[PDB]
Swiss-Prot record:
Substrate-specific adapter of a BCR (BTB-CUL3-RBX1) E3 ubiquitin ligase complex that regulates the response to oxidative stress by targeting NFE2L2/NRF2 for ubiquitination. KEAP1 acts as a key sensor of oxidative and electrophilic stress: in normal conditions, the BCR(KEAP1) complex mediates ubiquitination and degradation of NFE2L2/NRF2, a transcription factor regulating expression of many cytoprotective genes. Broadly expressed, with highest levels in skeletal muscle. Changing residue 57 to A: Loss of interaction with NFE2L2/NRF2. Strongly reduces repression of NFE2L2/NRF2-dependent gene expression. Impaired interaction with SQSTM1/p62. It comes from Homo sapiens (Human). Belongs to the KEAP1 family. Kelch repeats lie at residues 2-47, 48-98, 99-145, 146-192, 193-239, 240-286. It is found in: Cytoplasm; Nucleus. Changing residue 55 to A: Loss of interaction with NFE2L2/NRF2. Abolishes repression of NFE2L2/NRF2-dependent gene expression. Impaired interaction with SQSTM1/p62. The lineage of its organism: Eukaryota, Metazoa, Chordata, Craniata, Vertebrata. The modification S-cGMP-cysteine is found at residue 109. The modification S-(2-succinyl)cysteine is found at residue 288. The record marks 109 as: Sensor for electrophilic agents. This is Kelch-like ECH-associated protein 1. The chain holds residues 326 to 614 of 624 of the full protein. The gene is KEAP1. It comes from the Eukaryota.
């Protein structure tokens, strides 16, 4: 398995699909996205890598994207899927029962609280209950088949609140808020906790990391990252968290940091081939040859 980073932003949106091998340290250059996109999210269902939402920021135009695209590491090929009902820049996504939930994001000046669900067997999207809050730059994680939306920006205020979606009741309920306001944080699940790393509170990019324990319904800080960063990519690979790129108020970072929960330590493991923010990141099998 490899860590795939798709799209991103550096002076314009990007079409890179690159895969990192934590063992031998290589970055593999794979098939470009059909359309350059930043602020997208990545996920894996089956073994297929999906790139969801985002925005094409190009010298010739600036369009938010509703697109859903699917990458097969067996063929090194992208294929389009049916699009979401609306464009969603700075989206969050999560996977439950082989279905992709697309959460929040923006379209122009519209800040979504809508959520919709993709069924790959039918190549079909369907709207579900909207969140209690409009959230762009929202982090999303799935724990115990429940979907969590964490932080973000409602168009006026950045958020430390978090809410939880129950699919069997089709409803959202607020949970304990994070200690820190974060939009554009990296949010993932590791072991049995939700981690929220970095982000932007409207004043500073953050290096703090905190984790939600569902059993105690409390957020606790862990060791901070070495580099403050907002709009970072994040994923889990072999029991460790990897954060990729992001923006620190001055630079689009290429730093990749890795969190070992056994030692509560972050270390810098690699650099991306070029700094960028707003990537989509996920883990799946190595490509053919």
């Amino acid at each position: 398995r490899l860590i795939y980073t798709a799209g991103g932003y550096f002076r314009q949106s990007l079409s890179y699909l690159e895969a990192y091998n934590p063992s031998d340290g290589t970055w593999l250059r794979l098939a470009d996205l059909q359309v350059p996109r930043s602020g997208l999210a990545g996920c894996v269902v089956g073994g297929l890598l999906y790139a969801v939402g985002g925005r094409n920021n190009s010298p010739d135009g600036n369009t938010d994207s509703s697109a859903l695209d699917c990458y097969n590491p067996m063929t090194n090929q992208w294929s389009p899927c049916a699009p979401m009902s609306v464009p969603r820049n700075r989206i969050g996504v999560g996977v439950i029962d082989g279905h992709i939930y697309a959460v929040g994001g923006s379209h122009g000046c519209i800040h979504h609280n809508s959520v919709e669900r993709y069924e790959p067997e039918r190549d079909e999207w369907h709207l579900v209950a909207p969140m209690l809050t409009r959230r762009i730059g929202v982090g999303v994680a799935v724990l115990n088949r429940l979907l969590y939306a964490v932080g973000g920006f409602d168009g006026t205020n950045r958020l430390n609140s978090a809410e939880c979606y129950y699919p069997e009741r089709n409803e959202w309920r607020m949970i304990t808020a994070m200690n820190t306001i974060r939009s554009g944080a990296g949010v993932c699940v590791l072991h049995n906790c939700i981690y929220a790393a970095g982000g932007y509170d409207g004043q500073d990019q953050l290096n703090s990391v905190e984790r939600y324990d569902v059993a105690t319904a409390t957020w606790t800080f862990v060791a901070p990252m070495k580099h403050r960063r907002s709009a970072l990519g994040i994923t889990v690979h072999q029991g460790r968290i990897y954060v990729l790129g992001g923006y620190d108020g001055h630079t689009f970072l290429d730093s990749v940091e890795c969190y070992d929960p056994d030692t509560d330590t972050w270390s810098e493991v690699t650099r991306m081939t070029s700094g960028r923010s707003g990537v989509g990141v996920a883990v799946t099998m190595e490509p053919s040859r």
